[PDB]
C-alpha cells in the first residue's frame, strides 16, 4: 500500500541549509504527555481510546522556508472538530500553537509537517484531581508528500472508486478530520489494482467527495467547483478558492457529480501534504487536454509564492 | 462517555475465589509488545503506527473464565480471516498467536481475563530492519481483568436501549462491521445519543433501516420459538454463535438474516451478546417494555447455559497453565 | 385512508381570495379540460392507455403551473423546468416549448377557471401512435387544467400546520430516482404521509441517506434562523414556489442559503414553512411535537406569504393573463 | 430508445427445445380474441383498455401488481401470485376492492375471453381517483400475448450483463422492491446503462454494494453445488421460488441471502428468473465469461424442468376453461 528532489525552475523549492544534529530533537520532535522527545521514540499508551476506538481528531499544519502557513486557521478547525466529536480539549488554542511552534523550532526543520491530535485518552492521567483524561500529542517531522514534488508539476491520474464509498456524514463525518481510514485505504488499494495513482470516492448518493488525504476541485468555464458534503473542509482548498477568486474566477462549494468531473476543463487535488496537484487523467480518459491546466498552474504557482510573502497567513518560526 | 467485580449472589456469574501473588510485575495484567512481555500499565506503541493514524488494525478479544480459555481457537481463526480481508499481512502464525495469548494470561495470573490481540499495518520497517520485505505489520497482545460492557448486575436484571436516530452503522462498502475493528466513530455517537435519551445503550440501523448491532455487542431477539439476529453490517460474534448453538440445543429455530425495527418492537425477548459480559437481557426499547418487561424465559436459560459452559469440559474450553 | 391534499373556503380579510364570478357550464369543457392524444376533452372524460409506460413503469415527468385571478404564474419557468427534467429522464419530447405553453393556455381558457392547477406531463408512451413509423416519437404529452389544488387548506395556509421528521422512510436517492426530476414515484412520500398520520401530525419531512432534511410529500421545506432563509439543495425538487419565496426573502433583506439542512438546524429554527404551487406558503408551527420558535406563524413567513399572494395581482415578467 | 422486453401473438422459438407455443387458430370475430382487459366493471378489448388520468396509480404510482402466465392453456401458480399480490397491497396499505376468489375469476375470464393459450395476465390495484361513479381502489386486469424480457432464442443461447455503476436499486426504506411496483425510475436508468455499455441488461446493487435484481427479473447464481440469490431489496419472485424448489429437488443447496459482486464474478453459473420468459442463462458479466462461458449445466436442467412443469398435472398448474 529529509529534503526531496524538486523540479528545477518551478515554484517548489526547499530551503538551502544544513541541520545541526547535536540536538536529539533535530530532524523531528514530538510532544507526548508533557515531554518533548525525538520523533523516533514517541510512543503512546496502547489503552488510549484514540487507538482502540479511533476516538481522535487532528489537523496538520506545515512550515515552509521557516514559515508556518495558516497555523491559526488550522488550530481553530482542529478545535472545532474536537468540539463536534465531543472530545474535551486539554489545552488552550494559544497553548497548542505554542507546543506546535516548539516542536518545529526544536526540530530545526524549515520544511515541516506539524501534526497535533487530541484523543479521549486512556483514563485518569498518571498522578490529577474531574481532571481531563484527554491526551494531546504533537509532532513536527519532515514535510510530507501525498504526491511527489515532480508530480506536483507533471500531474497524476485518478479513478472514481467503484468498490468502496466514503464514510457518510451520519456514520463518521468526513467534516471532522479523523483517523478512520478504512474506506480511504480500500480506495487506495482499488486505485493500485486499476493502475492509477489515486482514487476519488463517491458518497452514498453517487456524488464526488474527496480522496485519501486531499480535496478534489475542478474548473469549468470560469468556475471552480468542489464538494460541500462528505469531505474535510480543507485549508488548502480554502486557499485555492481564495486564489481563484483573486484571479477573477467564480467558486462554488456544492454537489459535484461524476459527469461534472468528466466534462471538466481541469481537475486538481489539494492538501497540506503537497499543495495543489494537477489530475490529468480520470478513469483512463484525459482531463481536458491531458496536461496540467492553465488555472491549475497559476493557482499552484501563487500558492507556493505565498509561502514567502509577508501576510496575516504566514508566521516565521523562531529557531 | 461509558480484579474482581460485584456479582449477584446465587446467580450464574461468579468470579474465582483466590489471591493473586503480585511478586511478578506482570501479575494483574500482561502485554506483549514488539517481542517482550511487559506489565499492561507500561504497554506503549509507536505513535507512527498506521494502526493509530489510519486505524489500520483489526483484532479480537477472547476471554478466560475460572482459568479456562473460551473458544480461543475460534477467536484466532476469525481474527486471522478479518486480517486477510483487510489485507494486513500477519507477522505470526495461528499457533504463535495462540501461545502469545496463553502466555499473557499465564504471566498475568488472572483467572478471569479479557485477552485482546490485534495486528496493525505497522510504523514502517521494524528496528533492526534486516530486509526490505520483512513484514512491517505489528502484533500487540494484552491480558487484563475481565471487562463488562454491562455490569454483572445488569447481566441478571436487564438494560434498556434505544434505536439510534442520529447515527447509522458503518456500511459494508465503507468499512465492514464484519471485520472487528477500532473505527468506533458511529458507535461512540450512538453511545452519546443513548445517554442523552436516558437509556443504557443504543442499537444502530444500517442505511436501509435494518437493525444491526450496538457499541460492542450483537443484538438478538426471540419471537414465537425463533431467535433472530442480523446477518449484514454486524460482527459475526462468537458470543452470538454460542447463543445460537445453545438455542438450537434447546429446540428453538435460529435465523441469521435481516431484522427490522418492527420485528424488535413485536419481539417476545431481546438480548445483547458479547465476550465482554456474555448475554444481557434488554427489557425496554425506545421507552417501551420488551415483552413482559422483565428478562425473558429463553434469555435466562441461554445466559445460564452460557456461564455453565465455562466449567463443563468440552472442545470450547482450554484450561490455562499458570 | 390517506390525505395527500370550484371554490373553497378562505380566511376573510387575509391575502388569499378566489375570484368572484359565475362559470358558465354550456361548453362541456367548462370546469376542467384536458388535452389527450390531439384532442381537448372534459376533465372527467380524460383517460390514458393502461399500456402507457408512464403507468406500468412510472416512466413520466411533469410540472404543475397555477392560474390565480386569471393570471398564469411563472408559466415559462415551469415549462422550462419540465423540459429539462424530461431530457434528464431521456423521454423524447413530442412538442415544442411554445406548443406546450399554448396547450396549457388552451386547457385553462376552455375550462373558464380563473383559479386552476395546470398539469402537463410527458410519458415514454404505449408504443407506436395510432396512425403512426418507427420514425415518429412514441412519447405522450398529456395536459389538464382543473380547479386549483390545496395540499394544505387555505385556512391552514394562514393558521399553520404541524410536522414530524420521518423515521420509518427516507427520500429516494439521487442515484435511484432523483427528486430533482419532478416525478410520479411517490412510494416513499406516501409512506411518510402515513407515518405523519400515525404520529398525529399533518405532514412529515423526509431525510436522505446521510441524514439531511430534504422535502415533504408535494412541497419544499424552508426555515428561517437569525436573518437567513435555509432550504435543501440535494434530494429535493427545485421548487418554483421555493424559487419565488427566496426572491421575496432577499427583497426583504434576508440572506438565503440553498444547501444542506440538518435536523438540528430545523429544531433550532425561528420559523419553518412549506412551499408548493398547490397552496403557496404554509407556516409550520410544530415539529416532532415541539413548538417552532414561538409556536405561531412567524413574522417573516407571514410577510413572505402575503407578498407571494400580492404578486398574483401585480403585472410583471412573472404573470401572464389568460385569454378566456 | 428503450428496450426492456424483447418479445409485444406467437413468437419464434428454438426448434426441438423446451419452449414451444401451442398450434391453434384464434377465433377473431369476437372483439376480445387476442387480448382482453377488465376495467371498472367491463371486459374490453385490450387495445381499448384505458384508465382515468386522475388515478393515483398514475400520479403517485400508488399501485402494486403481479403478472401470472398461461402456457399451453394452463395457469401457472395462479394462487401463489394472487396471494403475493394481496400481501403486497396490504403492505402498501391499498384497500382491496375484491376477494381472492373474485380476482382469480377475473384473471381466468380475461384469459378465456382472449382465447390466448400462451398469455401474460397482469392484475394491479391502485389507490384510485376518488369516489367511484365506501372504497375508491381500482382493480385492473388484462390478459395479453405472453411477454418476453429476453427472447425465446436467448432463453436457450444466453445473454450478457453488466453490474450497473451509474444507478442503485430503490432501498427497502424508500420504496421496497419486496412489493412489486411500477416505480422503475432506477430500473429504466439501469436499462439505459446496459445499452450504453453494449450488454443486453444490467444487475443493480443496493446502497451497501450487494447484488439485487434487474429490470424485471431476479438474479441467481450457482457455485459448487449451491444456488444463491439475494434476500434484500428484491422482489421475491415466483420464478425464483420455482427454480429454488427445482434446485432442491435436484439435490442442490439453496441460500436466499446477501450476494456480492465478488461472488457473481466467481460463479459457476448465473441465470435470470422471471414470469416474462422463465429461466435465462447469463453467459457474460462485465465483459468476462461466466464460468465456462456456455449456458451452465444446472441452469439448463432447471430451465428444462420449469417448462415441463407447464404440462405436468400438479398443484402448480390449473387448466383454463376457454
Ligand atoms: C410539487 O408539487 C412539488 C414541490 C413544489 O414544487 P413547486 O413549487 O410546485 O415547483 C416540491 N416537492 C415535491 C416532491 C413536489 O411534488
Ligand atoms: C481526507 C482528507 N481530505 C483533505 C485533506 C487536506 O485538507 P487540508 O488542505 O486542510 O490539509 C486531508 C489531509 O491530509 C485529508 O485527510
Ligand atoms: C461491534 C461489536 N459487535 C459485537 C461484538 C461481540 O462479539 P463477540 O461475541 O465475538 O465478542 C463486539 C465486541 O466483542 C463488537 O465490538
Ligand atoms: C423487479 C422484478 N424482479 C423480479 C421479477 C420476477 O418476478 P416473478 O418471477 O414473480 O415474475 C419481476 C417480474 O417482472 C420484477 O418486476
PDB file of N, CA, C and O and ligand atoms in Angstrom, chain A residues 58 60 74 77 166 177 181 184 210-211 213-215 232-237 270-272, ligand 2:
ATOM      1  N   UNK A  58      -7.723  15.575  14.554  1.00  0.00           N
ATOM      2  CA  UNK A  58      -6.388  16.124  14.357  1.00  0.00           C
ATOM      3  C   UNK A  58      -6.408  17.147  13.234  1.00  0.00           C
ATOM      4  O   UNK A  58      -7.387  17.273  12.491  1.00  0.00           O
ATOM      5  N   UNK A  60      -3.142  18.941  10.412  1.00  0.00           N
ATOM      6  CA  UNK A  60      -1.739  19.032  10.038  1.00  0.00           C
ATOM      7  C   UNK A  60      -1.520  20.406   9.426  1.00  0.00           C
ATOM      8  O   UNK A  60      -2.111  20.733   8.384  1.00  0.00           O
ATOM      9  N   UNK A  74      -5.693  26.480  11.137  1.00  0.00           N
ATOM     10  CA  UNK A  74      -5.630  25.045  11.405  1.00  0.00           C
ATOM     11  C   UNK A  74      -6.082  24.714  12.825  1.00  0.00           C
ATOM     12  O   UNK A  74      -6.852  23.771  13.041  1.00  0.00           O
ATOM     13  N   UNK A  77      -9.803  25.041  13.312  1.00  0.00           N
ATOM     14  CA  UNK A  77     -10.551  23.922  12.743  1.00  0.00           C
ATOM     15  C   UNK A  77     -10.377  22.665  13.588  1.00  0.00           C
ATOM     16  O   UNK A  77     -11.351  21.959  13.879  1.00  0.00           O
ATOM     17  N   UNK A 166     -17.266   6.666   0.396  1.00  0.00           N
ATOM     18  CA  UNK A 166     -16.785   7.474   1.509  1.00  0.00           C
ATOM     19  C   UNK A 166     -17.727   7.352   2.701  1.00  0.00           C
ATOM     20  O   UNK A 166     -18.946   7.257   2.539  1.00  0.00           O
ATOM     21  N   UNK A 177     -11.749  15.985  10.630  1.00  0.00           N
ATOM     22  CA  UNK A 177     -10.545  15.257  10.239  1.00  0.00           C
ATOM     23  C   UNK A 177     -10.309  14.114  11.224  1.00  0.00           C
ATOM     24  O   UNK A 177     -10.255  14.340  12.434  1.00  0.00           O
ATOM     25  N   UNK A 181      -9.600   5.428   8.468  1.00  0.00           N
ATOM     26  CA  UNK A 181      -9.246   5.395   7.051  1.00  0.00           C
ATOM     27  C   UNK A 181      -9.660   4.091   6.364  1.00  0.00           C
ATOM     28  O   UNK A 181      -9.186   3.803   5.262  1.00  0.00           O
ATOM     29  N   UNK A 184     -10.828   4.888   2.972  1.00  0.00           N
ATOM     30  CA  UNK A 184      -9.767   5.529   2.205  1.00  0.00           C
ATOM     31  C   UNK A 184      -8.681   4.526   1.821  1.00  0.00           C
ATOM     32  O   UNK A 184      -8.159   4.564   0.696  1.00  0.00           O
ATOM     33  N   UNK A 210     -14.022  13.283  -1.799  1.00  0.00           N
ATOM     34  CA  UNK A 210     -12.611  13.606  -1.691  1.00  0.00           C
ATOM     35  C   UNK A 210     -11.845  12.316  -1.926  1.00  0.00           C
ATOM     36  O   UNK A 210     -12.423  11.291  -2.299  1.00  0.00           O
ATOM     37  N   UNK A 211     -10.536  12.361  -1.719  1.00  0.00           N
ATOM     38  CA  UNK A 211      -9.718  11.183  -1.861  1.00  0.00           C
ATOM     39  C   UNK A 211      -8.929  10.918  -0.593  1.00  0.00           C
ATOM     40  O   UNK A 211      -9.050  11.645   0.398  1.00  0.00           O
ATOM     41  N   UNK A 213      -6.679  11.693   1.619  1.00  0.00           N
ATOM     42  CA  UNK A 213      -5.762  12.719   2.085  1.00  0.00           C
ATOM     43  C   UNK A 213      -5.773  14.030   1.323  1.00  0.00           C
ATOM     44  O   UNK A 213      -4.851  14.836   1.509  1.00  0.00           O
ATOM     45  N   UNK A 214      -6.780  14.281   0.486  1.00  0.00           N
ATOM     46  CA  UNK A 214      -6.806  15.507  -0.302  1.00  0.00           C
ATOM     47  C   UNK A 214      -8.231  15.817  -0.731  1.00  0.00           C
ATOM     48  O   UNK A 214      -9.056  14.916  -0.887  1.00  0.00           O
ATOM     49  N   UNK A 215      -8.507  17.099  -0.918  1.00  0.00           N
ATOM     50  CA  UNK A 215      -9.769  17.502  -1.510  1.00  0.00           C
ATOM     51  C   UNK A 215      -9.668  17.447  -3.037  1.00  0.00           C
ATOM     52  O   UNK A 215      -8.573  17.438  -3.616  1.00  0.00           O
ATOM     53  N   UNK A 232     -13.642  16.708   4.127  1.00  0.00           N
ATOM     54  CA  UNK A 232     -12.996  17.669   5.011  1.00  0.00           C
ATOM     55  C   UNK A 232     -12.960  19.044   4.350  1.00  0.00           C
ATOM     56  O   UNK A 232     -12.516  19.152   3.204  1.00  0.00           O
ATOM     57  N   UNK A 233     -13.429  20.119   5.032  1.00  0.00           N
ATOM     58  CA  UNK A 233     -13.203  21.479   4.515  1.00  0.00           C
ATOM     59  C   UNK A 233     -11.732  21.852   4.600  1.00  0.00           C
ATOM     60  O   UNK A 233     -11.311  22.561   5.526  1.00  0.00           O
ATOM     61  N   UNK A 234     -10.955  21.361   3.637  1.00  0.00           N
ATOM     62  CA  UNK A 234      -9.517  21.533   3.687  1.00  0.00           C
ATOM     63  C   UNK A 234      -9.107  22.993   3.662  1.00  0.00           C
ATOM     64  O   UNK A 234      -9.814  23.868   3.145  1.00  0.00           O
ATOM     65  N   UNK A 235      -7.947  23.261   4.251  1.00  0.00           N
ATOM     66  CA  UNK A 235      -7.441  24.627   4.285  1.00  0.00           C
ATOM     67  C   UNK A 235      -6.611  24.955   3.042  1.00  0.00           C
ATOM     68  O   UNK A 235      -6.494  26.128   2.659  1.00  0.00           O
ATOM     69  N   UNK A 236      -6.048  23.944   2.387  1.00  0.00           N
ATOM     70  CA  UNK A 236      -5.539  24.141   1.034  1.00  0.00           C
ATOM     71  C   UNK A 236      -6.667  24.539   0.091  1.00  0.00           C
ATOM     72  O   UNK A 236      -6.541  25.493  -0.688  1.00  0.00           O
ATOM     73  N   UNK A 237      -7.773  23.796   0.147  1.00  0.00           N
ATOM     74  CA  UNK A 237      -8.973  24.112  -0.619  1.00  0.00           C
ATOM     75  C   UNK A 237      -9.403  25.551  -0.386  1.00  0.00           C
ATOM     76  O   UNK A 237      -9.703  26.286  -1.336  1.00  0.00           O
ATOM     77  N   UNK A 270      -6.017  18.991  -3.639  1.00  0.00           N
ATOM     78  CA  UNK A 270      -5.498  19.987  -2.712  1.00  0.00           C
ATOM     79  C   UNK A 270      -5.305  19.366  -1.338  1.00  0.00           C
ATOM     80  O   UNK A 270      -6.214  18.711  -0.813  1.00  0.00           O
ATOM     81  N   UNK A 271      -4.130  19.583  -0.754  1.00  0.00           N
ATOM     82  CA  UNK A 271      -3.850  19.082   0.583  1.00  0.00           C
ATOM     83  C   UNK A 271      -2.626  19.801   1.131  1.00  0.00           C
ATOM     84  O   UNK A 271      -1.773  20.285   0.380  1.00  0.00           O
ATOM     85  N   UNK A 272      -2.544  19.845   2.456  1.00  0.00           N
ATOM     86  CA  UNK A 272      -1.364  20.420   3.091  1.00  0.00           C
ATOM     87  C   UNK A 272      -0.108  19.613   2.784  1.00  0.00           C
ATOM     88  O   UNK A 272       0.993  20.181   2.738  1.00  0.00           O
TER      89      UNK A 272
HETATM   90  C1  LIG E   2      -9.413  13.164   3.935  1.00  0.00           C
HETATM   91  C2  LIG E   2      -8.636  14.432   3.733  1.00  0.00           C
HETATM   92  N1  LIG E   2      -9.109  15.365   2.825  1.00  0.00           N
HETATM   93  C3  LIG E   2      -8.411  16.533   2.624  1.00  0.00           C
HETATM   94  C4  LIG E   2      -7.236  16.777   3.337  1.00  0.00           C
HETATM   95  C5  LIG E   2      -6.477  18.060   3.102  1.00  0.00           C
HETATM   96  O1  LIG E   2      -7.065  19.168   3.757  1.00  0.00           O
HETATM   97  P1  LIG E   2      -6.028  20.323   4.222  1.00  0.00           P
HETATM   98  O2  LIG E   2      -5.837  21.210   2.999  1.00  0.00           O
HETATM   99  O3  LIG E   2      -6.576  21.116   5.377  1.00  0.00           O
HETATM  100  O4  LIG E   2      -4.723  19.657   4.592  1.00  0.00           O
HETATM  101  C6  LIG E   2      -6.739  15.850   4.245  1.00  0.00           C
HETATM  102  C7  LIG E   2      -5.308  15.955   4.749  1.00  0.00           C
HETATM  103  O5  LIG E   2      -4.468  15.076   4.525  1.00  0.00           O
HETATM  104  C8  LIG E   2      -7.457  14.668   4.434  1.00  0.00           C
HETATM  105  O6  LIG E   2      -7.008  13.751   5.341  1.00  0.00           O
END
